[PDB]
């Protein structure tokens, strides 16, 4: 299957996940196009054209597990899960990008105080785990470099204003070099933030774990050959 409108979703794995076109800049960029596809559970991705050299994010096509400005959470996702409950959140991804321009590839993890997130519930925190940085850079200030899950990550801490009095903390982990595969436990990252740094209360809930590419400019494609997020 494939789809090309902003906001189109393709469900897979008994609706546990969906690919989400997630286009933000349709009205900003003349001649944009972006298509998501799912051929099988080991062959899915998206293809984009964002002829722009402005530094705004145009789209974050992503695979979603759990909540994403939705009423509730994808079925069988295992979200939400409270940090204090210390469930393992094991992810697997293998992917390959062919593109020019400015983009990244990152996990996106959303947290709330509520365990009943609604379609308009602003997150309290966002965690990004970048496996690829191509000419881009994170929001916030650099803190330190840390080894987690067998990888080295530059850590940044910042705040995203959503407008209208809404917004959230953003914690970014950027791999010190790009990689095309990672098998991570999100709990390692949240425990670093909560225990090691005391920046994150364990009362919070993980609402979503997602993986996608922020595209700022250029044309290309991603293929994803392995994907899963399991909360247990």
What residues have CB less than 8 Å from 163, skipping those under 6 apart? none
**Resolution to 1 decimal place, in Å:** 1.8
What residues have CB less than 8 Å from 101, skipping those under 6 apart? 50, 134, 135, 215, 216, 217, 218, 219, 220
* Token couple for 225: 């050959």
* Token couple for 41: 């559970």
Question: Which structural domain range is residue 22 located in?
Answer: 1-232
CB 119 within 8 A of CB 71: yes
Which is nearest to 191 in space by CA: 67, 114, 84?
84
Query: For residues 132 and 138, what is the distance between their CA atoms, to the nearest angstrom?
Result: 12
The 3-state DSSP class for residue 219 equals strand
52: CATH: 2.60.120.180
| Phi and psi torsions of 213, nearest 5° | -120, 125
In degrees, rounded to 5, the angle at the alpha carbon of residue 125 between the alpha carbons of residues 135 and 148 is: 65
CB 192 within 8 A of CB 137: no
In degrees, rounded to 5, the angle at the alpha carbon of residue 90 between the alpha carbons of residues 85 and 94 is: 160
* Token couple for 173: 């982990």
| Phi and psi torsions of 107, nearest 5° | -70, 145
What residues have CB less than 8 Å from 106, skipping those under 6 apart? 128, 129, 130, 131, 132, 211, 212, 213, 214
Instruction: State the alpha helices, DSSP H only, in the chain.
Output: 186-191
Q: Calculate the dihedral angle through the C-alpha atoms of 59, 97, 156, 64, rounding to the nearest 10 degrees.
A: 60
Counting other chains too, the contacts that 166-170 makes at CB distance below 8 Å and 24 or more residues apart are 166/122, 167/122, 168/122, 168/123, 168/124, 168/125, 168/126, 169/124, 169/125, 169/126, 169/199, 169/200, 170/125, 170/126, 170/127, 170/128, 170/138, 170/139, 170/140
Query: For residues 14 and 2, what is the distance between their CA atoms, to the nearest angstrom?
Result: 17
Residue 140: is the preceding peptide bond cis (ω within 30°)?
no
In degrees, rounded to 5, the angle at the alpha carbon of residue 28 between the alpha carbons of residues 173 and 67 is: 45
In degrees, rounded to 5, the angle at the alpha carbon of residue 79 between the alpha carbons of residues 199 and 60 is: 75
Q: Is beta strand 17-20 parallel, antiparallel or unpaired with respect to 9-12?
A: antiparallel
CB 102 within 8 A of CB 219: no
Total structural domains within the chain: 1
Burial of 33: CB neighbours in 10 Å, binned 0-12, 13-18, 19+: middle
Query: For residues 209 and 207, what is the distance between their CA atoms, to the nearest angstrom?
Result: 7
Which is nearest to 73 in space by CA: 63, 64, 83?
64
| Solved using | X-ray
In degrees, rounded to 5, the angle at the alpha carbon of residue 55 between the alpha carbons of residues 51 and 56 is: 90
Length of the chain: 232
């Amino acid at each position: 299957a494939s789809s090309s409108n902003p906001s189109d979703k393709l469900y897979f794995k008994n609706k546990k996940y969906y690919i989400f076109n997630n286009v933000w800049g349709a009205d900003q960029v003349s001649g944009w196009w972006q298509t998501i596809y799912h051929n099988s559970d080991s062959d899915m991705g998206w293809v984009w054209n964002w002829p722009s050299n402005t530094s705004t994010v145009k789209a974050y096509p992503s695979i979603v597990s759990g909540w994403h400005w939705t009423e509730g959470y994808t079925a069988g996702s295992g979200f939400p899960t409270r940090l204090s409950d210390q469930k393992n959140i094991n992810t697997k991804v293998s992917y390959s990008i062919s593109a020019n321009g400015t983009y990244n590839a990152a996990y996106d993890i959303w947290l709330h105080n509520t365990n009943k997130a609604s379609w308009d519930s602003a997150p309290t925190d966002q965690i990004m785990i970048w496996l690829n940085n191509t000419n881009a850079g994170p929001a916030g200030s650099y803190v330190e470099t840390v080894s987690i899950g067998g990888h080295s990550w530059k850590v940044y801490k910042g705040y995203i204003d959503a407008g209208g009095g809404k917004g959230w903390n953003v914690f970014s982990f950027i791999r010190t070099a790009n990689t095309q595969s990672a098998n991570l436990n999100i709990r390692d990252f949240t425990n670093y933030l909560a225990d090691s740094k005391q920046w994150l209360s364990k009362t919070k809930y993980v609402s979503s774990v997602e993986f996608g590419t922020e595209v700022f400019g250029g044309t290309g494609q991603i293929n994803i050959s392995n994907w899963d997020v399991t909360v247990r």
